[PDB]
Amino acid sequence: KIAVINGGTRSGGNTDVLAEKAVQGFDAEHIYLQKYPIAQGGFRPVQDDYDSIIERILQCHILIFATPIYWFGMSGTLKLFIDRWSQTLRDPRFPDFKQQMSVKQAYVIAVGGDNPKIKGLPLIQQFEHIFHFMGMSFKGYVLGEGNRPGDILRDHQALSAASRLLKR
Amino acid sequence: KIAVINGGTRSGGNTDVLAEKAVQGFDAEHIYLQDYDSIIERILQCHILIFATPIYWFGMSGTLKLFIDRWSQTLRDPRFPDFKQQMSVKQAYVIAVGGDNPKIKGLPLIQQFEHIFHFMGMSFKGYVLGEGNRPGDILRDHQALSAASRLLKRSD
Amino acid sequence: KIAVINGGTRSGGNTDVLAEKAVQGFDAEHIYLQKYPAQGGFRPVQDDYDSIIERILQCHILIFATPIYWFGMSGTLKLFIDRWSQTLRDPRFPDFKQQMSVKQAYVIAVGGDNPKIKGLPLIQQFEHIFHFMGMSFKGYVLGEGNRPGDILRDHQALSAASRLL
Amino acid sequence: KIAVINGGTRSGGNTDVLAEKAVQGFDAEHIYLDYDSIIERILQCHILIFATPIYWFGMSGTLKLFIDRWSQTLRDPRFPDFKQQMSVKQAYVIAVGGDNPKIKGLPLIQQFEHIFHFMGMSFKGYVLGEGNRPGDILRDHQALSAASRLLKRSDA
Ligand SMILES: [Pt+2]
Ligand SMILES: [Pt+2]
Ligand SMILES: [Pt+2]
Ligand SMILES: [Pt+2]
Ligand SMILES: [Pt+2]
Ligand SMILES: [Pt+2]
Ligand SMILES: [Pt+2]
Ligand SMILES: [Pt+2]
Ligand SMILES: [Pt+2]
Ligand SMILES: [Pt+2]
Ligand SMILES: [Pt+2]
């Protein structure tokens, strides 16, 4: 039903925390985009399980893209994941990808430490163009403030915004 | 202490309601644009300014646009010699409601306000974009209502 | 065929000059939005609003030319566009929506505060406005200038204006 | 003295055509995204041109991974003056795509503006060009002209 595509870190990370507030209680598909060390910028995304991820995403009506804001954009893992949709749109193993994605609802959770409420707007507008291209309805988002793990818990505005993320 | 600069039409409209949610318990001064000099005199006396405007064509109301545009005259008015200095120490907020996916399509307007405030040296402390079509509709926008109620809180 | 909606100050104005170049040679319908008593010292007048609509409705290409005031369009252009809400339900112009949905739109905006960057929100606001109307946003020019004649120094803008249509 | 940081590949494609129009006559260094070696080469140039095809209304994945790594460089003891060195450089952006890029690529330009501002680098200019298939960029006369004059400080 609901999938959370996490392009941040895991266990404690501000991205994980905010996402849990948004999907609390649901039996949501939790996707974590893998990355291997070569810490921000110290990794390289791993996409060995990309097809498995697409398979899971296709079964979900609601998609929540959760990401830290790196250099005023999304994470390296989420950027390489979305860029690969270009390949999937030409993939015979997922012949109805465009149509299937077009009926889904999308949400975004992004956390940054440099006045995200303002400096994170270009990223939200970028997501707007991405979803519009796919015909996906961009239903809502949350911009949260945080630098180190767990500091999002101090952004009460973001915590309550995430809890009220899913439209009703 | 707090001034709500109302750019719509005083009539229990969605923008008015959302701004009231933000200032509940603060006993703010409500300035309805829709007497320019008196308005300027009144806002200069407030530390916090909340610009509340319905969203028209992905921007502010024509009333609020004519109001801010006239600041160009005030920046050179000898009766208000310290206008820019006084404004720069104020904290500004924006509350805007519209019926066409405003939380997403109203972002350019938020960026314009960011530039206006930065130009004046004012701190842009927060904003809330809300969704509504007919009066009262905003009371169903849980996310917006929650955000407005927390707008001016120092610790919640 | 082509219409230039000018929301600035005429003759010699940076906005007038760039628009002039964009439609140089063409027999374009020149629409100037009225205003009477310098920035912020006027009040737009729309007594001729209906005749202006009648004219743009006959043009396939619409060029919106405006100075950048407070990071937005001019007061006259803002009040003009805002009124489209009334026109969209006006018995006098039964087909406004459909007629506008087939026109091509362009924007020429001039500002004195690093417009190539600070004028982007305005261009994005125009993108939403045109998309709402079904109008194709074909291109734009962001010129730098604050005083009459200044736009003659922005050769990059004059070029663009020339290569706009 | 100047470097073109290409986030595409060496292929003589639309982004490369536009970038070349800008550095013609400058004998610029062409870097096609040896990370440490690349950082050393760019640190020696006072003008940096970031050239990238537009993917999903953003930069290429290759350029994204490169700029993201600056976070590591900002804390790398082997490059103790990285931030300071970059701050005195002039940055330009050349970006080409086939989905109404001059309009839909604006958020990307704003991101670059934030990236450069964070580094203290002067964002001197940019060109968004239209091109769907190889060679299409030659039809975008506005972009070709803008790229031609991008680094010029004289006219005719
Ligand atoms: Pt994080
Ligand atoms: Pt469903
Ligand atoms: Pt990473
Ligand atoms: Pt106060
Ligand atoms: Pt405005
Ligand atoms: Pt002018
Ligand atoms: Pt035509
Ligand atoms: Pt005016
Ligand atoms: Pt040089
Ligand atoms: Pt290309
Ligand atoms: Pt990017």
XYZ file of C-alpha atoms in Angstrom, chain C residues 114-117 120-121 123-124 127 137-142 153 155-156 159-161 163-164, chain D residues 100 102-104 106-107 109-110 113 123-126 128 130 141-142 145-146 149-150 152 155:
46
model
C 20.876 40.545 -10.258
C 17.723 39.530 -12.187
C 19.299 36.428 -13.780
C 19.025 34.942 -10.281
C 13.739 33.423 -11.307
C 10.825 33.130 -8.871
C 9.654 33.478 -14.183
C 8.442 30.408 -12.238
C 5.282 29.321 -15.677
C 5.435 29.315 -22.225
C 7.848 29.542 -25.170
C 10.717 31.619 -23.790
C 11.828 34.670 -21.816
C 14.525 37.261 -21.336
C 15.835 38.547 -17.989
C 24.716 47.832 -21.826
C 24.197 43.111 -25.025
C 23.376 39.595 -23.858
C 20.715 39.509 -28.293
C 18.266 37.284 -26.448
C 15.412 39.704 -27.112
C 16.541 35.757 -30.730
C 13.391 35.448 -28.585
C 11.707 22.677 -21.896
C 14.992 27.028 -20.100
C 11.939 26.946 -17.908
C 11.974 23.549 -16.165
C 15.300 26.855 -13.197
C 15.215 24.908 -9.917
C 20.023 26.875 -11.557
C 18.798 27.895 -8.093
C 23.345 29.348 -6.938
C 28.039 32.681 -9.864
C 28.852 34.722 -12.964
C 26.446 33.320 -15.536
C 24.626 30.338 -16.952
C 20.248 26.580 -20.414
C 17.438 22.894 -25.623
C 20.347 30.081 -31.504
C 19.611 31.944 -28.278
C 24.819 33.109 -28.770
C 24.684 33.253 -24.956
C 29.561 35.499 -25.163
C 29.550 33.822 -21.744
C 33.541 37.754 -23.067
C 31.449 43.368 -27.487
